[PDB]
Amino acid sequence: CPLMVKVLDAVRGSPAINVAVHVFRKAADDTWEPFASGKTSESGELHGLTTEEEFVEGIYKVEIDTKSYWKALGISPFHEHAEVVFTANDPRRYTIAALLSPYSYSTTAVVTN
Amino acid sequence: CPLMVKVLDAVRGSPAINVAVHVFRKAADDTWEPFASGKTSESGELHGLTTEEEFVEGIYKVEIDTKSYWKALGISPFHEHAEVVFTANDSGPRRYTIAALLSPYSYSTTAVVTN
Amino acid sequence: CPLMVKVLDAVRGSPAINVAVHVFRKAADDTWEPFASGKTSESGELHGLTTEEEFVEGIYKVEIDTKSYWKALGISPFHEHAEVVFTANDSGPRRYTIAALLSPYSYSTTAVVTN
Amino acid sequence: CPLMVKVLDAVRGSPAINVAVHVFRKAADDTWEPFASGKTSESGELHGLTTEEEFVEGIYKVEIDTKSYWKALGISPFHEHAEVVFTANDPRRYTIAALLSPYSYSTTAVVTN
Numbered sequence: 001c002p003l004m005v006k007v008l009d010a011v012r013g014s015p016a017i018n019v020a021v022h023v024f025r026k027a028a029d030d031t032w033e034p035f036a037s038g039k040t041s042e043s044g045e046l047h048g049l050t051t052e053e054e055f056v057e058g059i060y061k062v063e064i065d066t067k068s069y070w071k072a073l074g075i076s077p078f079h080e081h082a083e084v085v086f087t088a089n090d091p092r093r094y095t096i097a098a099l100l101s102p103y104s105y106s107t108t109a110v111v112t113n
Numbered sequence: 114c115p116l117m118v119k120v121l122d123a124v125r126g127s128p129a130i131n132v133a134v135h136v137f138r139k140a141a142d143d144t145w146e147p148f149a150s151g152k153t154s155e156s157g158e159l160h161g162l163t164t165e166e167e168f169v170e171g172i173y174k175v176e177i178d179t180k181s182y183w184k185a186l187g188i189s190p191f192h193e194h195a196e197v198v199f200t201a202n203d204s205g206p207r208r209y210t211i212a213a214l215l216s217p218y219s220y221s222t223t224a225v226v227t228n
Numbered sequence: 229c230p231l232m233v234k235v236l237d238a239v240r241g242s243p244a245i246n247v248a249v250h251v252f253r254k255a256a257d258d259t260w261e262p263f264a265s266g267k268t269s270e271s272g273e274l275h276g277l278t279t280e281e282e283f284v285e286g287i288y289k290v291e292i293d294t295k296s297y298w299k300a301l302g303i304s305p306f307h308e309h310a311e312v313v314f315t316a317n318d319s320g321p322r323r324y325t326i327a328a329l330l331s332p333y334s335y336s337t338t339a340v341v342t343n
Numbered sequence: 344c345p346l347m348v349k350v351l352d353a354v355r356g357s358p359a360i361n362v363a364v365h366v367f368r369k370a371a372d373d374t375w376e377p378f379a380s381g382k383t384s385e386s387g388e389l390h391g392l393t394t395e396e397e398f399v400e401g402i403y404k405v406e407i408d409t410k411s412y413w414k415a416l417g418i419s420p421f422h423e424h425a426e427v428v429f430t431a432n433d434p435r436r437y438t439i440a441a442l443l444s445p446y447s448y449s450t451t452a453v454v455t456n
């Protein structure tokens with residue numbers, strides 16, 4: 001599990017559940033190629049995206065479908081999505097945490113061995 | 114302004130208006146002595162708390178009354194308030210801005226310190 | 229100013245100065261068309277990106293070049309940049325401020341929207 | 344485990360390890376009485392602070408010794424500490440997460456069953 005994404009709701013003080021997350025890798029032609037995706041769990045976490053063998057060095061984009069999240073709660077959101085773009089370098093485990101509000105998002109990386 | 118507070122509302126995407134702020138200074142005796150107070154304006158800013166002469170060295174507490182803010186809006190939040198405690202002016206006079214971002218279950222504060 | 233960006237540095241407790249910002253608008257064709265660009269001033273603010281007339285309805289991307297900022301300071305950060313994508317002016321003209329707080333391994337953005 | 348505290352370093356992208364945390368409960372005379380304390384673990388988490396039986400409704404203060412944390416890293420910090428003050432109400436598990444930078448701290452609550 002070199003990559004885990006966790007999503008939090010700052011309005012309700014809870015995990016953000018059933019949030020779609022899409023991971024892309026940057027290809028040599030600068031396009032974004034699908035890499036991994038899923039929906040956050042009841043704990044707001046998304047496990048099992050990738051394996052060490054697949055997760056090579058490069059530039060990755062994590063897109064979080066925050067607009068659907070908010071609209072399903074009957075709340076009009078500001079952003080079209082939340083995006084986090086980063087280079088993976090060879091400590092080895094990346095946790096991407098995002099904290100969501102209708103008009104704000106924050107993202108932090110915790111990178112450990 | 115040697116001491117300013119600015120507050121944003123991350124739910125409404127607006128300044129956080131009419132937020133009460135109480136400032137305290139730790140006294141000789143190690144209690145919190147009231148120092149100044151005010152509330153944020155339509156721009157979410159609070160100016161005119163103090164003066165260069167009055168804002169001497171010390172340990173200051175900026176209490177941001179986030180609970181009353183969310184409750185005045187008829188919303189039930191997590192925290193009682195936001196407290197920001199720092200030593201000020203120990204290397205000569207500086208200008209301090211306390212910036213805060215509020216959500217019902219989260220807040221954040223950052224300090225901008227200028228000479 | 230219909231569109232403004234302000235950026236703070238949570239490490240130094242200062243405005244984030246000389247941060248490059250590129251704005252894009254999604255085009256007819258579904259690509260990102262360059263729209264405007266600038267860099268933050270000594271106050272960490274970026275004014276004069278656009279005009280009311282030019283800032284029509286659309287989907288806008290504000291790219292904040294945080295990597296170049298941390299690297300110009302000789303520091304190695306996590307993110308490539310900060311991207312902020314939103315639909316603007318779909319209910320008539322508004323004024324948008326994109327506020328960001330930066331640390332090497334974390335950033336945060338909030339929008340203040342006024343009428 | 345009705346109360347867990349987690350502390351993150353936004354400068355290094357890591358758990359904030361060996362950070363002292365003190366919990367107090369507000370007494371009827373408005374003083375703060377010691378309640379629980381410890382140091383964050385290698386994951387930046389502090390488990391086992393209290394039990395359901397001890398953790399009654401009331402106002403609690405969590406104080407995080409951020410100044411020592413920064414100074415031990417050779418960094419001059421802005422705040423004297425980070426503090427989080429909240430009322431416990433009868434969902435039942437509170438996670439207090441704090442993200443630290445020299446001149447900033449953020450705190451979020453995740454409150455689940």
Ligand SMILES: O=C(O)c1ccc(-c2ccc(OCCCCCCOc3ccc(Nc4ccccc4C(=O)O)cc3)cc2)cc1
Pocket residue numbers: 006008097098099106107108119120121212213214221223234235236327328329334335336337338349351440441442449450451
């Ligand atoms: O258990 C876990 O795995 C876990 C759970 C939760 C975790 C966290 C913890 C903390 C997190 O995020 C908070 C984020 C960063 C700080 C806050 C937000 O942003 C701003 C704050 C203040 C701002 N003010 C400002 C800036 C410039 C100009 C003007 C202003 C103003 O007027 O207020 C602007 C933006 C996210 C996730 C981490 C780990």
